[PDB]
Amino acid sequence: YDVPDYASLRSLVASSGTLEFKNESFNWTGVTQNGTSSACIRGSSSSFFSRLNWLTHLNYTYPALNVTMPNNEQFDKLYIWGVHHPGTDKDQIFLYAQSSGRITVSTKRSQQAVIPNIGSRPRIRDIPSRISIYWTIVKPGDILLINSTGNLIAPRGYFKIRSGKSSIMRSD
């Protein structure tokens, strides 16, 4: 993974000091879930990240998404998601029916639109493809709306972002 503005996401996560992930029942319909990768091995079997849900085409199609998740209670909700940058056009068609799928994650305050760009990056751990990790924070009273046409790596829930005295450091 490569995180655009990595030094800001690291500081944002390290300032809360809480990994209380709470699963939420999202409305992913018409697509298959739980994508599998071979470079990620858990229990001597192919696997993937636990928090992020890699979606893929179901029955040779990928319907457009429009999901929402309101924030009722009085605390912020941080959603970590991403976009998959494939290796070649073949690797894009094999996973999605769309070659250049846009994505758009919007709150009432602001929106984020991302276009995945196909590119033959140098192989690291025998895989050329990459993923880019973004984040959207939802204030109380707002809603989170996710629209996508491909290359979406959705959250399974939300992190409880809160003010705190935590910090991060790098030592040995």
Binding site: D5, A7, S8, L9, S11, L12, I161
Partner: protein
């Protein structure tokens, strides 16, 4: 004998933004801490010199 400070950076926030906001908060805190130490040292020095002046006199 104050000095004009017409335009400055924003010193209050209502959102998490990233590294530039954290840098602005950090520079604000460092400036405030430095000026607090300067004020305390200045007050201590002036009090010491006044108390010694009005006793040497």
């Amino acid at each position: 004998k104050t000095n004009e400070k017409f335009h400055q950076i924003e010193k209050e926030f209502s959102e998490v933004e990233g590294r530039i906001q954290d840098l602005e908060k950090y520079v604000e805190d460092t400036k405030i801490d430095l000026w607090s130490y300067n004020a305390e040292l200045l007050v201590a020095l002036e009090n010491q010199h006044t108390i010694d002046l009005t006793d040497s006199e």
